[PDB]
Amino acid sequence: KPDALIHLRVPAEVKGRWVKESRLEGMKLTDWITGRVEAKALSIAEVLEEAAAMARSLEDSPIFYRNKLCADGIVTIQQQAARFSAATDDATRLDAALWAREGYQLLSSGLPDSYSGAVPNEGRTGWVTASQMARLFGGEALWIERCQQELG
């Protein structure tokens, strides 16, 4: 792939202090900021916890009983998510994470495609929650490739 560029407009003192700390840490500035953002940024493990929390929130919402696909996906995200924290074998984790989105995919394929009025009642459509879950997991190929790279 080709690389991409990111431009940071920050106060002058912030840039000077970052340059000082980076020179102290023995790395190039871009690498320093990259490691510092990655460290705290996100977790593969963390995502499942969230997605399960949103699924349990949906469980007490009308979208849970719209059709079998939504309920099955919610229950699956939780079930598989739980399985994932039981540890001691990365093989299962790789399986549980792929299952996790697989449950999500089920929920998103069970969600409606049209609503009435101006804005959807989030309880009856769950589109924003599904958007958040799609952001958490990412693309199908992206999430699968991440899981195979991390837990391969």
Partner: protein
């Protein structure tokens, strides 16, 4: 009348990279696959549509043509009735004009409401609308779908220009043809949402044209006709789709505000409806 005046097309989907959308004709179509998904602790089957791993934006393209002569029916009615119906529609067009309906139609075109679920969770949505005459484009419009509201009709120079063009189409001074492209920056390799078809095994089959994902024309028309803010006792609530009974937020038949009651009282009893309600009547006349 029951002859469709706002005739849309199926909106075909394609995938590409944002900021490369200017040359979007080459963009490969979004394919619909049929995947197996693991169920609750067991393999169900579902249709799924995704973008390639190197594409972050969805191009949804359709063609909408606006035609004139709303009051002229298609059913061979008793001629005496049709004379008065045509007279009523003509007196409306003279007195009021299509300006309000056309502006609201152009609003629903520009806000990308036809991207029913594809609009939510998108980083940025942009609507290009080209008035096409002959084999080339007569005029061009570019809109920020998220910047313009989804519950607000406000005046804008370029949007009012599109409104005037749609009014030219609806008035009968010549049918107008628009190509409508929507670019939604949904996310590198994310899920796109084509129209669903209830599978009455497969659970819910996705709609596709020639191995390309698409939103059905009826759904685009439903999105287009979210015009009426004249239903009883709901100011802040956004417009709903124009139906005869206005079911969903509903124009109850008992209330004189229903389409059939109003139209019959208007043409037969010569009782002119409310000004705001006139549009509702001619809007579902345009719907067909």
């Amino acid at each position: 009348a029951f002859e469709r005046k706002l005739d849309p097309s199926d909106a075909l989907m394609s995938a590409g990279a944002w900021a490369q959308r200017d040359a979007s004709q080459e963009w490969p179509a979004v394919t619909v696959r049929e995947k197996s998904v693991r169920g609750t602790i067991n393999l169900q089957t579902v249709d799924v549509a995704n973008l390639p791993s190197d594409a972050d934006t969805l191009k949804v393209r359709f063609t909408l043509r606006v035609l004139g002569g709303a009051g002229t029916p298609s059913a061979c009615n008793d001629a005496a009735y049709r004379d008065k119906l045509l007279q009523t529609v003509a007196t409306y067009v003279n007195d009021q004009g299509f300006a309000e309906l056309a502006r609201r139609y152009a609003h629903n075109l520009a806000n990308a409401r036809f991207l029913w679920r594809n609009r939510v969770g998108a980083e940025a949505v942009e609507v290009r609308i080209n008035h096409i005459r002959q084999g080339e484009v007569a005029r061009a419009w570019r809109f920020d779908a998220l910047a313009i509201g989804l519950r607000d009709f406000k005046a804008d120079a370029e949007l009012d220009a599109l409104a005037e063009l749609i009014a030219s189409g609806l008035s009968g001074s010549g049918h107008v043809l628009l190509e409508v492209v929507a670019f939604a920056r949904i996310g590198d390799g994310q899920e796109v949402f084509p129209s669903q078809e209830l599978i009455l095994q497969k659970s819910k089959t996705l709609y596709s044209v020639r191995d390309a994902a698409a939103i059905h024309s009826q759904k685009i028309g439903n999105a287009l006709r979210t015009i009426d803010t004249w239903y009883p006792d709901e100011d802040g609530l956004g417009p709903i789709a124009v139906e005869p009974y206005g079911s969903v937020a509903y124009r109850q038949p008992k209330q004189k505000l229903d389409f059939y009651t109003l139209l019959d009282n208007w043409v037969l009893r010569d009782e002119a409806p409310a000004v705001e309600q006139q549009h509702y009547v001619i809007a579902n006349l345009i719907r067909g």
